[model samples]
Target: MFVEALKRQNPALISAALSLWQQGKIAPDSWVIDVDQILENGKRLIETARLYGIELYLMTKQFGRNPWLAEKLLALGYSGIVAVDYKEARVMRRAGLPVAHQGHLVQIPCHQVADAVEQGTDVITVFTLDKAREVSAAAVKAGRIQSVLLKVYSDDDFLYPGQESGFALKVLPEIVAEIQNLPGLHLAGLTHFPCLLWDEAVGKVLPTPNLHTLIQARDQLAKSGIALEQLNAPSATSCTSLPLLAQYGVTHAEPGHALTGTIPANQQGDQPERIAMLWLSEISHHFRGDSYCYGGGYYRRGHAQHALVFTPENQKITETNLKTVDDSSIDYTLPLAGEFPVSSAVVLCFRTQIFVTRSDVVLVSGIHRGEPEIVGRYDSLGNSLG
Candidate 1:
C-alpha cells in the first residue's frame, strides 16, 4: 500500500529497513519507523496547531506507545500525551512524560483512580458522574481539585464497536450539574472520539456527527453559564483536519496517526505529512502460485492491496496483488504474478495501530541525514526489546 510512496519520497528508509532485516537486527513481521521523519512531522503539526491556538497532544498508542518517540515529541514542543488507555498513561507517566489528557477511549479503572490522581493527569475524561466520583475521591485524598473532561456523544456520532461509552449530548446540563456537586472534581472540558472522517468517494476528510456533538454541547454549556477550558476533538487530527476543527471551535487536538503519516487523509494523497512507517516481512514459502509472508504485524483494517517484494542484496522489485488474509490466517499471502523467491523481503504501508498488533516496532533515526541508526526497539505495547 505505501512502499512505493516511501521509496519515491525517501529511499533511505527502504534501505534501512532491508539492511536491518538482512543483518538480523530486526526480525521479519516487524514495523520499521523512521524516527527522524516522525519527529519532523510532529514538529510541523505542533507548530501548525499552536498557530491556530489549538493545544496539541501527541497520542503514541497507534505506534506502540513508544516512550522514546513520545520524548522526542515533547522536545519538539508538543503539549503532552493523550493516553488512550490506562496502561498507555502509566507508561507515559513512568517515562516522566506529562499526560495532558487520559481516559478518552477507555476510562480509568476504579482500582487505579488513586494512581491516576497521584500521577496527576491534567484532565481526565469521564463518561459518567460515577467515574467522576472515583476521581473525586482520589483527588480529595490528595487534597486537590482534579480537572476532568466530560465525554459527550450524539445519536449520529460514529462510534466504533465497544467504543460507545460517553454520555449523550441531551444530558449535558444534568452532567454539568452533577459534576459541579463533586467537591474534588472540576468539569474543565468536553471531548468526542472522531471529529473528522475520510470519505472515499470524495477523497477528503469531513466533519463527523461527533464534531457536531462537541460544538452543540459546548454552546449549550456556555448558555448554561459554563465555560470549558478545553474542547478536545481528537480523531484524525492532522494538518488537513486542523483548520476544520478550529472553524468548529475545538481548542485541543490529538495527533496519533498524524505523527507517523498513516492518517487516512495521507493515504489519499493529502501530503500533509510524509509516510514514516512501514511493515516488513519475508516470504516463508511459495506454493500454488501464492507467496506466504510472515505475519504478526498485519492489521485487519490496513486494507492491504499489494506488496513490494525484493531481495536483500538487490534493488530489483516485484509488485504483486494481495490475497486477503482470513481472520484465522496467520500469514499474508500475495498472488505470484511475477517470480518471487522464498525469503524475499516484503513491504506494505497501510492504516496501522502497532500497539494492538504483535509486531515489534523498530525505530530508525538519522535517515533524513542519510545515516540510518537503530535508536530503539520495542514490543507492540512499548516494552523494550532486543
Candidate 2:
C-alpha cells in the first residue's frame, strides 16, 4: 500500500498482497497505491484495499479522456485523486466525481483560471515557480484551492534544473505575497519530490534542497504574513532518513519510493513490510534455441537490463530468479519477479515479462508468499471484478 504507478500487468502482486492481508502482515494505511490504473481494476482494488485497511487515492495525469473512470472510482469508494493541474481538475470537476482533487500547478492556464475557484480544488501543488504563479493567481482570482505543494527537483529528477536548489521563495516574493493575501489558499503545506538521493559524499543532506529552501521560503513568507499549515517534501529516499525530514519540521510527509522499499545500495533502513508485498511477478515462455522471448517483452525497452536474454550459464526461468512461462502458448501467470506488467488481466498475453533488468528496477523488496486467497480481480485494462 504505497504510492507508485499501478499498471495492468502487475495484478499478481494483488493476489500475493491479499494473502499477506489475510495473514494480517500489513494494513491498508501501511500502503498508498497510485491511482494510475486503479480504474482498470477499480472495484476489486478498492474492495481489497478497504478490506486490508488501505486508503485509496487516485494518482492520474489524464482526466478529460477518462471522465467515466473518475465517476466509477467514486462509486467504488476511493479517498481522492491527484490531478496533474487545473486543466485536469477542470475535467474531473466537470465529470462530477466526488473524489477530492490535488491540483498540480505547472502553469497558469488562461482558460481555467476562473473555474478553479468555482470548482474549489483540494490541494494546489507548486512544483516550481510555474506552480506558485498558477496557484497564487487562482487564489487571487477566486480564493479556493486548499493545500500547496512546493516542488524541489534536483539532478536526480528527470526534470532537473540544477542550481543551489534553494531560494525559490526569496526570488518569488510576489508569489508568496499572493499566497498570503488569499484567505482561502492555506499554505496548508509544501510538497518536495526528491526522486533521487544525492550521493552524500558529493553533497551532504544538510541545507537539504527541499527542506532548506522550503524553510527559507516559509520563513520569508511568514515574515510577509503567509502562515503555512504544514510542510511536506516527499523523497524517494526519505524512508531512509525519517529523522532528517522530521528535524526539518516535515510533519505532513509523503513516502512514495520508500513504499517500494527500493533504494540504491549503501543506503540503510529496516525493510520489514516491504518484505511482505513488493516487486513484479511475470513468467517466461518458449525457449528459442539459446534464448527465449519473455511474455512481457512488448513494453520492454531497447535497454538490455530490463529484458533478460538467455546466457549459456543460465537457462531456466527459475535460475533467473524471475518467474517465467514454460509454454509459449500460456497467457498470464501469477506474481512476477521484479516485473512491471502493462496489462493485469489475461489479454494481449504477449506483453508480460519474467526477468528484470537493472534499469527495469522500479523498486525491489522481498515478498512473503503463501496460500492463495481471492483478494481481488481486475479486467485486462485493470477494471476490477464485479
Candidate 3:
C-alpha cells in the first residue's frame, strides 16, 4: 500500500532506493525520515522505519491541517511531531498528536506560562530570561510541560567566536529556580549552541561547556526539585566531537541544510551552519538570456559560465529533496534512470528519532552560475515545479 504510493510519486528514486536497500547501500544508520518528505512517502517510510526499527516524528513549518498531508502522516506511523513555531505546537496537540515545539526565541516570543495554556504546548524553550518570569508563569498555569530547555553561551564568545551567542548560564540560576518551583514544568537540561563564539580562530576550537557548568545547572535544578532530562549541544564541526552527548542527557542534535551538503559558492566560507539544512535543487529552464545582478548574485550586471551544483541557480531549489538525500558527499548527485525527484519538505521516519532543520536557505544552483536546473520546488504552501 505504502510503497505503491511512493512509487507513483517518486518512481525514479523509489526504484533506486529499493535497489539500494537490497544492496545495503542505504544502511540502517542511514535511516533518517525528515518531516519534509513525511506526507508523500509517509506510509512507505513508516514501513521502512518499522523494518529498520526506526522511530518517526513530524516537523512542520506552519501548523495548518493540510488534510492530505496530515492524514497521510498519521498513516505513516508517526510517533510524534515538532513544530517550527510555538503556536504550531498547540496546533499539533489540538490536532491530537504529541509534539516538541522548535523555534527561535525571536519569533513568537513567549512567557512560558501564558503561551503554554493558550497553545497547548508540551514544551517551552527560550534562549534567555529576557521574558523569564512570564514564561515560568505560563508553565505554571499549563500544569504539565514535559521539558524546558535553556540555551548556554560563553562569556568571552572569543573562546567560541563563530557561535551564535556567547551568553552562558548568566540567567541559568534564575530560570532553573523558576522552573524548579513551577510544578507544571520539568527542567530538561540545557542546549549549548557552538559556532563563531567558540571557534573564532581557525585553530581555536572552544571546549564543550565545562563539567562545572553542567554540574552547576543540573545540581541547581535537582536541588530545587527538578529532574534534568536532556543536554543538547551543537558542535558538529568541533574536534572533540560529541556523538556521546546523548548519554549525558543531550539526546536530540539538530543538523539543517548540510544533510544534502552542497551549498552555493557565494555562500561558501560564510558560515557552514546557515547552509546546514538547505537543499540543492535542479530544474529544466529555457534559455532566456536576460539576466541582472543582485546581492544574491555574484557579478555586477551579467556573467555567463559558472561552477554550479544544480541547473538554473538563482531561480533555485527552495524546499525539495528532504529525506531523499543520501548521507554522504560522493553519492549526492541525482541518481539517473531509476531515481525521480519528489517534492521536498522535512521529516523523521523513525518514531521520534530525528528530523532536519528548516530555518535557513542553501541553493546549490543559482541564477548566474546556475547548474542542475530545479524543475520543481516544494516549500511551505508555495510553488511546486512539477
Candidate 4:
C-alpha cells in the first residue's frame, strides 16, 4: 500500500535497505526503519501540532520504543513520549528520555509506583481509585505531587479485548471527588485509548465513541470545578486528524503510527508523512506450489496485501497470497506464478503493531541526506542488540 509513496518521497531509503541486505549487513525477517524520514516527519508533525495548539507526546511503541529514535524526536521538539506500559516507561526513563504519560493500556503496579514516581514521570493515566491511591502514596513518599489523567469510557466505546481499563462516564463526579481527597495526587487531564479509528469501507478515519466520552467528561469536570489541564486523546492523531481533534478541544495527542507513516489516514493520500518502514524477509524455500519466507515479524492484523521479492541484483518481483505455512509454522507461504529463488529479499508493507511481534527492527539513518548509516538493531520490545 505504501510502496509508491516511499519510492517517490525517499528512494534512497529503498536503495539503502536493499544494499544492506545485499551486503549481509542486515538479516532477513527484520523491520527496516528510515530514521531520517522519521525525524523529518516528526519535525513536521511537531510544527503542525504547535500551529494548532496541540501538544504531541511521541508514542514509540509502534517503533519498539527505540531510545535513539526517541532522543532524536525529543531534539526535534516533541513533548516527550507516551509510554504504553511499565517496561517502556522504565526503559525510556533510564535512557534519560522524558515520559509525558505512562500506564495508558497497562497501569503501573503498586510495587513499582514508587520507582515510576521517583523516575520523574510527568504524568500517569489512572482508571481506578485504588491505582490512584497507589500512585498518591508513591508520590507522597517521593515528596512530590504527581499529576494523573483519568481514563474515562462510555458504554458504547470501542475497546480492545483485555484493554478496557477506565472508569465509566457516569461516575466522573464520584471519581473526581475521590481523586481530590488523595494527597500528593492531582487530576490534570482525561485520556482514552483511541479517539478515532479507520473505516475500511469508506477508506477514511472517523471519530470513535471514546471521543464523545472524553468531551463529555471534560464538560462534566468543569461543571464540578475540576477543570482539566489536558485532554490526552490518542489514536488517529495525525496531521489529517489534528484539526478535527483541535475542534473537539483535545489539548494533547499521542501519535504512534503517524510518526512512521503507517496510519490509515496516510493511506488515503491526505498527509505529509510517507511509509518509512517495511518488513524485509527472504525466500527460504519452495514447497507445495508456494514460496516460503522466514517469519518472526508477521503481525496477524498487518493488513498485508502482497510481498515485493527483490533479488541481490535489485530486480523486483511481486507475489501474493502471503499466508502462514501452518498453525505451528514460523514461515510465510507466498503463492506466486514463478519460482522465486532462495535468498531473495521480500518486502511487505502494511499497518503493523510491531511491539507485539518478535521481529528485529533495523534503524537506518542519513538516507535522506548524505551517506546512509545503520543506527542500531533492536528486538520487538526495543531491547538493543546486534
Candidate 5:
C-alpha cells in the first residue's frame, strides 16, 4: 500500500536497507524501520494536533509495539499509547510508555483489569457494566478515581467483525446510569474506532457511520444531563484528517498508521508524514522460472505489488513484480514475477501488523543524514532480541 510512497519520497531509506544487507548488519525476514523519517513524521503530527486542538495518542501495534520508536514519539509530545489490546498495553506499560486510552477495540481481560489500573492509564474505554465493575473494583482498591470512556455504537454503523461489542444507543441510558453509579469510575467521555476512512470510489477521506453514531450518543448523553469530557475518534488520524476530526467535535484522536505514513489516503497524495517502513528478504530459489524469496512479514491484506532487489556482487537496484500471498497457505516463500539470482536482497513496503509475524524488527536511524545505523533489534512482539 505504501511502496510507491517509500520509493518516491524516501530513497535514502532504500539505500540504507541495501547498505545494511551488504554490511551483514541485517538478515532476511526482518522489518527495518526508518527511525529518522518516523520521528520527522511524529513532529508533523504533533504540530498538526496542536493546531487543531486535538489531543493525540500514539498507537504502536502497526510497528509491533517496539519501544525504540514509541519512546521517541512519546518525547515528541504524543500523550500516550492507544494500546489496542491487553498484551499491547502490557508491552507499553513495561516500556514505561503511558496508556492514553485502551479497551475499546479489544478490552482488557477480567484478570488483567487490576494491573491495567495499577499503571497510570489516562482513560479506559468500557462497553459493559461487567468490565466497568472490574475497573471500578481495581480503582477502588487503588483509592483512585479511574476515568472511563463509554464505547457507543449502532447496528447501522460499519463495525468490523469481532469489534462490534460496544453499547448500542437504545441501551446507552441504562448502561450510562449503571456506569455512573460506580464509585470508582468516572464517565469521562465516549469513543469509537474507524471514525474516518479512505473511500476509493468517493476519492476522499470520509467519516464513517460510526462517527455519526458517536456524535448522536454524545448528544443523547447531554440531554440526560451527562456532559462528556472527551470524544476519541481514531483511525486515519493524520495531519490531513485532523481538521475534519476537530470540526466533528472530536477531542481526541489516535494516530498509528499516520505516524508511519501508511494510511490508505497517503497512497493517492502526499502527506506530511513520509513512509518509514519496509520488509527485507532474500531470494531463496527459482521455481518453474519464477524467483521466490523468503517471506515472514507479508500481511495478507498488505496489497504488496513490487520489490526492489539488489545483490552483494551487483548493487544495482532491480524492481521486481510481486503478488499477495494466497490465503490458503502459510507464507513460507513468496514468488517474484521474474527470475533472479539467489541471495539477492529484496525490499517491500506495505500495510502490516508485524506482531502477527515471526519477523525481526530493527530500528534504524541516520538514514536522512546519509550515515544510517541500526539502533536496536527486537522480536516481532517488541521483546529485545539482542
Candidate 6:
C-alpha cells in the first residue's frame, strides 16, 4: 500500500532496515521504525496542528505504544496520548504518559471508571447513558467532575464494521439533557470516528458525513441550552486534514496513522509527515516456483502488491508480486511469485497497527544522518525485548 511513498519519502529508512536484517542485527518478522523519521514526523504534525489551533492527542497503537516513542513525542510538544483501549491506557499510564483523551472507540470498562476519573483524564468518551452514569457514579465517589465526549453519529454516517456503538444523532437532545442532569458528569462535547476519509472521485481525503452529524449534534445541543466545548474528530487526523477540521469547527483530533505517514492520501502528495515504518522478514524457504518469507505483520487491508527482495550475495534488489494471506488463517509464511535463496531479506511497506500484530518493533535512529543505529527494541505491545 505504501511502497511508492516509502521509496519516495524515506529510501534511507528502507536501506537501513534491509541492512539490519542482512547483518543479523534485526530478526525476521520485525517491524522496523526509523526513530528520527518518526520524531520528525511528530514535530511536523504538532507544528501544523498548533498553527490550526487544533488540540492533538497522539494515538500510539500504530507505533506499538512504546514508552520510548511516547516520551519522545511528548518532548516534541504533543499534548498527550489517546489510548484506543483501556489496556493501551494502562500501558501509557504505566509509562507515565498523560491520558489526555480516554476510551472513545473503546469505552472505559464499567469497573475501571473510578480509576480513570481519578487519573485526571481530560475527557472520557461515552456512547451510552449507562456508561455516563457509571462515570458519574465514579466521579461522585471521587468528588470530581469528569468531562465526557459523546460518541455521536447519524443514520447515514459511516461506521466501521464491528465498531458500531455510538449514539445516533437523533438522540442528542434527550441524551444531552440526561447527561447534564448528572451532577458528577460534564457533557463537554461530541466526537465521531473518521471525520475525514479518502474521496476517490476527488483524489483527496475529504470530510465524511460523520463530521456533518457532529456539527448538527452540537447545534441541536446548543439550541437546548447545552454548549459543547469540543468536537473530538478521530481517524485520518493529520496536518493535511487540519484545515478541514478547523473549518468544520472540530476542536480536537486523534492522530494515529498520520504519525507514520501511512494514510492512503500520504501516497498521493508531499504530506507533512514522512513515511517512517516498514515490515521486514527473512526468507523462510522455497516451495515449487515460489519463495516464502517469515510473517507476523500481515494486514489484509494493507493493499500490498509487491515485495522487495535483497539477495544475500551481492545485496541485489528485486521487486516481485506478493500473495495475500487470508485473515482467518495464522500467517506463518508470506509467499512471493519468484523463488529466491534461503534467508534473503524481504521487506514490505504498508499501513499497519503494530499493537495488533505479532511482529517485534525495532526503533532505528540516525537513518538520515547516514549512521543508522538500533536504539530500542520491544514486542508489539511495547514490552521491552532487548
TM-score of each: 0.96, 0.49, 0.44, 0.94, 0.97, 0.98
- For residues 219-239, could you state the per-residue lDDT of candidate 6 as single tens digits? 887786788888888888877
TM-score of decoy 4: 0.94
Question: Per-residue lDDT tens digits of candidate 1, residues 1-386?
Answer: 56555666656777788887778887887889998889888888987888899989889988999998899888888877889999998788878889888888899999998888887788999988888989999999999899999988888888889788888888779888999999999888988877888787998889898888888888888898998899998888998788888998889899988887887776543476888888888888877777778788777787777788878567676777667567676544444345578888888777788887888899998888888889899899988896
**Per-residue lDDT of 95 in model 1:** 85
Model 3's alpha-carbon lDDT is 0.36
The root-mean-square deviation over C-alpha atoms between each candidate and the true structure, in angstroms, is 1.7, 11.3, 13.7, 2.0, 1.2, 1.2
Clashes of each: 0, 32, 75, 0, 0, 0
Ranking 5 against 6 by lDDT, winner = 5
Which is the leading candidate under lDDT? Answer: 5
Ranking by lDDT: 5, 6, 1, 4, 2, 3
Q: Candidate 3 lDDT, tens digit per residue, 96-118?
A: 66554443322245543474445
- Better lDDT candidate (1, 5): 5
Model 6 clashes, total count: 0
lDDT of 2 by residue, 325-362 (tens): 34334423322334322322111111121122111111
Candidates' C-alpha lDDT = 0.83, 0.39, 0.36, 0.82, 0.87, 0.86
TM-score of 6: 0.98
Superposed on all Cα atoms, model 3 deviates from the true structure by an RMSD in Å of 13.7
Q: What ranges in model 4 sit over 4 Å off?
A: 268-270, 313-316, 319-321, 324-338
Task: TM-score winner between 3 and 5, please give it.
Answer: 5
Q: Which regions of candidate 2 fall more than 4 Å away from where they truly are?
A: 1-101, 105-120, 127-147, 150-170, 181-184, 195-208, 223-225, 237-240, 263-270, 276-288, 293-317, 321-370, 379-382
Candidate 3, poorest ten consecutive residues by summed lDDT: 292-301
Better of 1 and 2 by TM-score: 1
Model 1 RMSD vs true structure: 1.7
